[PDB]
Amino acid sequence: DVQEQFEGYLREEVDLLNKFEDSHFKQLEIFYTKSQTDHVINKDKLQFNALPFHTTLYKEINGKRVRLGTLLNWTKAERLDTIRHESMIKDERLRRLIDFDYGWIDYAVVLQRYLDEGNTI
Amino acid sequence: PVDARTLQSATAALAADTGQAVNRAQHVSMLTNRLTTANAPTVRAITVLT
Amino acid sequence: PVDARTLQSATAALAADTGQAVNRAQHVSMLTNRLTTANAPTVRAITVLT
Amino acid sequence: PVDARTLQSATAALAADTGQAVNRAQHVSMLTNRLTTANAPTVRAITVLT
Amino acid sequence: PVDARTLQSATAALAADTGQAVNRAQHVSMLTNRLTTANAPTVRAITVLT
Amino acid sequence: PVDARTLQSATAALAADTGQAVNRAQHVSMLTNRLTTANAPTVRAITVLT
Amino acid sequence: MTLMIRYCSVQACMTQFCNDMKLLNGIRAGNYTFIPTPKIICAYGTPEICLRAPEIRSFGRYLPIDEDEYSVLNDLVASLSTNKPKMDFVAQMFEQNGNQVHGIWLDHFKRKNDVNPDGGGIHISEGLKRLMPEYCERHLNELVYKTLDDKVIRDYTSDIIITNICKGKLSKAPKLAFFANFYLSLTGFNGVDSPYLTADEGVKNVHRVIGLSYRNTLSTSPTANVDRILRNNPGSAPAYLTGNDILGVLSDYPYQNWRTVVELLDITEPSATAIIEVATNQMHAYLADKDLNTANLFDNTSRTYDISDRTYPKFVNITSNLSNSNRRGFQLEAMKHIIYMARRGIATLANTHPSKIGNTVYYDY
Amino acid sequence: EKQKLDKLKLFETSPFDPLTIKNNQDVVDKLYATQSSSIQEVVPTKTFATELQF
Amino acid sequence: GRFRYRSELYRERDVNSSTVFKTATPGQYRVVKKISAKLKSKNANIVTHPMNFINFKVDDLDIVVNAGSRLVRGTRAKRIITPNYGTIYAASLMTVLPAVRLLSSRASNMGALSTQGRIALPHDVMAPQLAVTSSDDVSKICVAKDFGQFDTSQWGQISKAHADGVRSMKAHYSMGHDTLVDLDLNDASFADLLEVTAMSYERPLKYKMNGLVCESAGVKSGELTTQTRNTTTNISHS
């Protein structure tokens, strides 16, 4: 009955792979906003513009669709102010961090939640 | 229920017994190119009936 | 009309009787490599005419 | 303890004395394909006991 | 002026008669690999001059 | 100083006479495998000393 | 992988690896960015791995992924890497700057074996024409221009990837060299307990089931063997020829004509016969790793395992008559299943045929 | 469950195994196309070789 | 040169007269990148300029070569890499490389206290020690030695000893000169190459980086030669 155990272990491997991919997509859903469109690689026709800031590229094969990945168009950066922006940053300490280099913006707003938790360093 | 030797093993034994090569066409290849065990139970039942 | 039967079975026997090798030059392959059935209806009518 | 010698030196002579083809199937392949040294210490212990 | 006749017809006949094999090595390969018609006009005229 | 002539011509003559094949194991391969001319000058000196 | 052999378990190392994957920059081109699916690990071209057994490379093929899903993943990963930008860069550099090789290397690399370049009239492929002496000079220039590395080639590669992906053009993945389903049965232990006390439980279990490897018994890559043969006999083959190029051009042609090939590469007999023997016995290793650049892969944990001729008879049962290269390839294929099973402390024997094909019939040997 | 049964019956419906299929295919692939025209006139075609060996 | 390629990926705003050009196609642009770089790698320099590697003048023993710096993980001392000059490199390839290749090659059925045996997989390399440290037998002892700052010890007498050991092989090669002379690599007798390698071994060599120039008379950290000299010194010590 070793063969059946081997087959079950491979099936568990497939389940783990699916869970791992889903977790990766869910985690990337917070750094950039929720995916706005599902663009089919072959069926749909797009002219490389009018594509939203975050798109999920899928491919269709034999009546089924698979998840190729994610596309980010940096021209439509306005969506990113939904999650990170200078407007929400209020505490005087992080303004200088924002001015030094904008790259910290995300972390900055995260820090503010800690500051809005009442705890001060 | 039956216990049978693998068809591939017997084919290997026969190929070694004769001279069987994949480069050159031979009669042993014709013999061993259509060995099917799919209808074995039917022939077994026919043998018992005979 | 004629019965459409492939020449695969006949040509397999020809390769078996006279050993045909993939890596060797033989006279038998000269016959097989130029077996064309394209002009069969013309030859058929000639046979009737004769 | 015993010396460590690759089987290729001895197998090369066996292949040359007979005729070994990478495509044909012969009896020499059957002998060489199943050459195992994994159980050497056990057989060596058997030889001394005998 | 001279006609254009390919050497493929004659070379195939030579290969068939000598049993040329791609894997093996024979003397018939030492003749076909040196078959060059580059200097035919020179040897053609030397034939006439003799 | 010595001349530098490639032994490809000699090898081809040896290969054709023995009918050496890529896919078999022959004694000619073992002679051919280990034709090392790296230690030639030392052997040349030994020959003169004798 | 090298972490897992020392102080790190599969749970911790795999969590670290997943978090490392989640933060990768992604393909950036122009003002667009592509983040491909993380399921490219199991695809061909990347190390095909199962998460619970990461040591076994190229094991993702046997997983019960859907055939269409696996096919599309293979095309995706194949398209993720292209060689067109480097060729274009080299071609334009050659057209703009001209020849760069010295005349001494031009005259030294000349045909010496006195063999017709036309060959036996056989089909001279692109690689053979690249490596043949009469066309050496251009080839040499390419090497010079393959030396130069700059941002622009990888920006162009990213742009090509983006355009090809979005337009719907997926590169067709190359076929797999070896693939066979092996059916397992129970058997006994062979190995000895692992001196690696700190290592993870799976690796120690594998050491207990199969055993530990040694430098004498460790397998050697075919490219290294061809390089050793070429270096030990200078003057027999042109100096520019490397083991990788000869192995590739041999893998393109059928073996029946291999000898003719080594005659067109101007390889003298001592190197020629040895190269032919190495290709005959060790083509499986080259074909298995043909599509993956293993320059950055030093699988220490995979190397610690004893996968050699000493453990093949006790764990693999192949009865069919096959050539040495195919036999060794299928032996590694079976060893993959053996290692995956042995990671859990169960010793198994692989066979090429199921034990019970029918509810009535039972097979042996 | 039917797919596993079909794959298993494939083993018994023919005397070959994927190992032997690969071994046989390693012999005739690219063999006919590589040779010259004259030799091509005196060797079997690839489809012919596959028909003979299978 | 200038590398040009067609991109359908940028935007209209990004179009500037320097890099990206608006083309006939409404959405397709042409991006050019101006490159000017030196082929500093060993192989490209070998093919392009071999006269530097082949021809050797005495003065090349006095010229300076750029050094490299490699930081290491941890707080260990920074490593300095001092490559040899091209002519000296060719001489080392001709003469000293066989010794290194023989040292690196260890095969089965050889004694432990052999030239190859004395000098990857941690368990196999440390196997004798692993067996000794777990054994009822107490006669066997493990002794471990680490040598540091031995370059000062490498300075002076033992560098000349290495040079003399290399020179000792010149008695087997006939043609030779009393002193160092300018030579052609493919015409020079092996004695001249051995003598030039000995001079490179024993003479101090000059290296520069960050505007600092220093001379070394010890191991010199020359590639393909450190391992042999260090292991010979350690063997003598033992």
The string of DSSP letters for chain A reads: -HHHHHHHHHHHHHHHHHHHHHHHHHHHHHHSPPP-EEEESSSS---SSS--SEEEEEEEETTEEEEEEEEEEGGGGGGGGGTS-TTT---HHHHHHHHH-GGGHHHHHHHHHHHHTT---
- The secondary element (H helix, E strand) that includes residue F30 is helix F27-33
Tokens found for residue I199: 């001079």
* Closest-CA residue of chain I to D4: I109
CB contact under 8 A, A6 and G186: no
What is the greatest pairwise CA distance in chain D?
A: 42
CB contact under 8 A, E19 and C24: yes
What is the greatest pairwise CA distance in chain E?
A: 43
User: Which chain E residues have a beta carbon less than 8 Å from that of C21?
Assistant: 21
Sheet holding G348-351, edge to edge: G183-186, G348-351, G316-317
What percent of the residues of chain E are helix, what percent strand, and what percent coil, each to the nearest 5? 50, 0, 50
Q: Which of F12, F15, F22 shows the shortest C-beta gap to E23?
A: F22
Q: How far apart are CA C25 and CA H32, in angstroms?
A: 12
Task: Report helix angle I226-237 to I157-167, nearest 10.
Answer: 110
Distance from CA of F43 to the nearest CA of G (A): 17
- Is the separation of the CB atoms in G327 and G318 below 8 Å? yes
SS3 G351: strand
What's the gap between Cα A87 and its chain centre? 22
Q: Which of C23, C26, C27 shows the shortest C-beta gap to E22?
A: C23
**How many CB atoms neighbour CB A4 within 10 A?**
8
Query: Is chain I touching chain E, with at least 3 CB–CB pairs below 8 Å?
Result: no
- Is the separation of the CB atoms in G185 and G351 below 8 Å? yes
Tokens found for residue I142: 């493990």
Q: How far apart are CA G8 and CA I157, in angstroms?
A: 48
Residues in Cβ contact with G20 at an 8 Å cutoff, skipping those fewer than 6 apart: none
C25 at E interface, C-beta within 8 A: yes
State the DSSP code for E21. Answer: B
Is the backbone of residue D2 left (phi > 0), alpha (psi -120 to 50) or beta? Answer: beta
* Closest-CA residue of chain G to I31: G156
Resolution in A: 3.0
CA dist F7 to A97, F11, F36, Å? Answer: 76, 6, 11
Query: What is the interface size between E and H, counted as CB pairs within 8 Å?
Result: 17
CB contact under 8 A, A75 and I9: no
What's the gap between Cα A31 and its chain centre? 5
Tokens found for residue I163: 């040079």
- Give the angle subtended at the CA of C37 by the CAs of C36 and C42, to the nearest 5°: 120
Q: How far apart are CA E14 and CA E18, in angstroms?
A: 6
Q: How far apart are CA E37 and CA D24, in angstroms?
A: 40
CB contact under 8 A, G310 and D38: yes
Distance from CA of B34 to the nearest CA of C (A): 13
Query: Is chain G touching chain I, with at least 3 CB–CB pairs below 8 Å?
Result: yes
User: Which chain G residues have a beta carbon less than 8 Å from that of A61?
Assistant: 68, 71-72
Length of chain H as a residue count: 54
Q: Chains touching chain D at 3 or more Cβ pairs under 8 angstroms?
A: B, F, G, I
CB contact under 8 A, E34 and G119: no
Sheet holding I205-209, edge to edge: I65-66, I205-209, I212-216
User: Which chain G residues have a beta carbon less than 8 Å from that of D34?
Assistant: 313
Q: How far apart are CA D46 and CA D34, in angstroms?
A: 20
Q: Chains touching chain B at 3 or more Cβ pairs under 8 angstroms?
A: C, D, G, H
Q: Which residues of D7-40 are buried (b: 16+ CB within 10 A; e: fewer)?
A: eeeebbeebbeeebbbbbbbebbeebeeeeeeee
DSSP structure string for chain I? -EEEEEES-S-STT--SSSEEE-SSSS-EEEEEE------SHHHHHHH--HHHH-B-GGGGT--EE-EEE--SSSPPPEEE-PPPHHHHHHHHHHTHHHHHHHH---SS--TTSHHHH---HHHHTHHHHHHTS-S--S---------S-HHHHSSHHHHHHHHHHHGGGGG-----SS---B-TTTS-HHHHHHHHHHHHHS-EEEEETTEEEEE-S-TT-TTTHHHHHHHHHHHH-
Query: What is the interface size between D and F, counted as CB pairs within 8 Å?
Result: 17
11-50 of E, contacting H, C-beta below 8 A: 11-12, 15-16, 20, 22
What percent of the residues of chain G are helix, what percent strand, and what percent coil, each to the nearest 5? 50, 10, 45
Residues in Cβ contact with I24 at an 8 Å cutoff, skipping those fewer than 6 apart: none
Compute chain F's Rg from CA coordinates.
14
Q: How far apart are CA A53 and CA A34, in angstroms?
A: 10
User: Which chain D residues have a beta carbon less than 8 Å from that of B15?
Assistant: 25
CB contact under 8 A, B30 and C24: no
Q: How far apart are CA G299 and CA G213, in angstroms?
A: 13
- The secondary element (H helix, E strand) that includes residue F17 is helix F8-18
* Closest-CA residue of chain D to F24: D21
CB contact under 8 A, G346 and A68: no
Q: Which residues of G126-138 are buried (b: 16+ CB within 10 A; e: fewer)?
A: ebbeebbbeebee
Q: How far apart are CA G250 and CA G244, in angstroms?
A: 10
Residue in G180, G220, G176 with CA at minimum distance from that of residue G317: G180
Query: Is chain C touching chain A, with at least 3 CB–CB pairs below 8 Å?
Result: no
D8 at G interface, C-beta within 8 A: no
CB contact under 8 A, B19 and D23: no
SS3 G295: helix
CB contact under 8 A, G320 and H22: no
- Is the separation of the CB atoms in G215 and I121 below 8 Å? yes
* Closest-CA residue of chain D to G317: D34
* Closest-CA residue of chain G to B4: G363
Q: How far apart are CA E17 and CA G330, in angstroms?
A: 41
CB contact under 8 A, G314 and D38: yes
* Helix ranges, chain G (H): 10-22, 67-79, 84-97, 103-108, 126-131, 136-147, 151-167, 201-209, 222-232, 243-252, 258-264, 269-281, 283-288, 300-304, 312-315, 324-342
Q: Which of C12, C16, C22 shows the shortest C-beta gap to B23?
A: C22
Beta strands in chain H (DSSP E): none
CA dist I188 to B26, D44, F27, I88, I182, Å? Answer: 64, 58, 41, 14, 9
Q: How far apart are CA E10 and CA E32, in angstroms?
A: 11
Task: Give φ, ψ of G201 to 5 degrees.
Answer: -65, -35
Beta bridge partners of I183: I56
Beta bridge partners of I208: I66, I213
* Closest-CA residue of chain F to E26: F16
Task: Give φ, ψ of G228 to 5 degrees.
Answer: -60, -45
Query: What is the interface size between B and G, counted as CB pairs within 8 Å?
Result: 35
Q: How far apart are CA B18 and CA B14, in angstroms?
A: 6
E33 at F interface, C-beta within 8 A: no
Query: What is the interface size between B and C, counted as CB pairs within 8 Å?
Result: 20
Q: How far apart are CA G108 and CA C12, in angstroms?
A: 54
Q: Which of B23, B24, B34 to mutate to test the interface with C (most CBs of C within 10 A)?
A: B24
State the DSSP code for G191. Answer: -
CA dist F21 to C14, F8, G18, G20, I48, Å? Answer: 27, 16, 53, 53, 41
CB contact under 8 A, A68 and G76: yes
G237 at A interface, C-beta within 8 A: no
Distance from CA of G143 to the nearest CA of F (A): 28
State the DSSP code for G237. Answer: S
Question: Within 13 Å of residue A38, how many CA atoms lie on the same side as its CB?
Answer: 6
Is the backbone of residue G119 left (phi > 0), alpha (psi -120 to 50) or beta? Answer: left
CA dist A97 to A81, A87, A103, A119, C36, Å? Answer: 18, 14, 9, 19, 83
CB contact under 8 A, G214 and I124: yes
Query: Is chain C touching chain H, with at least 3 CB–CB pairs below 8 Å?
Result: yes
272-311 of G, contacting A, C-beta below 8 A: none
CB contact under 8 A, E29 and G259: no
- Is the separation of the CB atoms in A14 and G64 below 8 Å? yes
Beta bridge partners of B31: none
**How many CB atoms neighbour CB I141 within 10 A?**
6
CB contact under 8 A, I47 and G100: yes
* Closest-CA residue of chain B to H9: B38
Question: Within 13 Å of residue G37, how many CA atoms lie on the same side as its CB?
Answer: 28
Method by which the model was determined: cryo-EM
State the DSSP code for G110. Answer: -
User: Which chain G residues have a beta carbon less than 8 Å from that of B29?
Assistant: none
User: Which chain A residues have a beta carbon less than 8 Å from that of G355?
Assistant: 3
**How many CB atoms neighbour CB H30 within 10 A?**
17
What's the gap between Cα I2 and its chain centre? 35
**How many CB atoms neighbour CB G37 within 10 A?**
20
Is the backbone of residue G266 left (phi > 0), alpha (psi -120 to 50) or beta? Answer: left
Residues in Cβ contact with A105 at an 8 Å cutoff, skipping those fewer than 6 apart: A84, A85, A86, A89, A98
Distance from CA of C21 to the nearest CA of B (A): 4
Q: Which of G116, G256, G257 shows the shortest C-beta gap to E33?
A: G116
Tokens found for residue I7: 């991109």
Distance from CA of B20 to the nearest CA of C (A): 12
